[model samples]
Target: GFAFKRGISTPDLALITRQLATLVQSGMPLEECLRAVAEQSEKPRIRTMLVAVRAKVTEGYTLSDSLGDYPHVFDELFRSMVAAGEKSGHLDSVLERLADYAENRQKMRSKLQQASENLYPQ
Candidate 1:
């Protein structure tokens, strides 16, 4: 059994975002794209959130609005960029940029951890 949880790792976010961008840019419907992404997730919480987000979109909420419901997972910058993308009709590109940001953040975090480990030799 999987427990419900909050928060997502940067690498996971980057992977999800990259997949979404690919699907969206390929002309998939929003719900279908989300379903595809959700199906690929191994984590219960990520899959659950993706499914929930698709349901919200099905109910007519904008993608950004639906994602905003999980602030701990998505964050303010993510939501804001999504909102802007929706408004500008460039969601695929925005998602690509988000994926890059997530990947960069993850890399930086890893580098910082390595530096700290080297400094303290723990």
Candidate 2:
């Protein structure tokens, strides 16, 4: 699970990542992309964070800097990945790769969680 389990789930992150990436690839501007995905989420905490992120972007913060505000929610590894992607000027592909990475983690954890729940049933 993510450090807090209250902001966004791994599965949710992957979906958000994929949707944002596709929106970028389809030529939506980044700010609107952020707003669109932010609007899409049903989870309030996640939605709130994303809305904050978009605000930061509109206020001239880079995506990396916006995400930096919630290290607990975004995690160092994921933000660093985005940092590199932005630096390389290839963020679209990088976002897609991150989606795959996050999704695989979700699968692994789902299985691990199944075993643990089977034993603990708590």
Candidate 3:
């Protein structure tokens, strides 16, 4: 069974990223967005992880550190841009751009995977 565990069995970072992007885009406050994600995420582990993030954000932490709590989900590029956005006070827009970049990357990856699978005759 593939349980919805963050950094565990789920590995659904893509979905988490998209959800974070969407929540930010929808004009929900940052802490509120994190809480929403924590409440709505499919896995208990994800909820636990996000609750910590939400508390930090609510207590005056930036998104970068909140993401930093889970390095497996937020790496250098992720934290770098988030830190930049936090410094610049443009985190929502930056997150939106990151979301766009991620979507395009996913599309390109799918195309490459399809081509490779075709070559493999599978």
Strongest candidate by TM-score: 1
Model 3 TM: 0.74
The 10 consecutive residues of candidate 2 with the worst lDDT sum are 1-10
TM per prediction: 0.89, 0.87, 0.74
Runs in model 3 deviating more than 4 A are 1-11, 114-121
RMSD of each candidate relative to the true structure: 3.6, 3.8, 4.9
Between prediction 1 and prediction 3, which has the larger TM-score? 1
lDDT of 1 by residue, 85-120 (tens): 999999989988988888899899879988999999
Clashes of each: 0, 0, 0
The local distance difference test score of model 2 is 0.84
- 1-122, model 2: which lDDT tens digit per residue? 54554446778887888888889778888899998998888877878888999999899988888999988778888888888888999778778888788889888988898899999965
Worst 10 residues of 3 by lDDT: 3-12
Q: Name the lDDT value of residue 100 in candidate 2.
A: 82
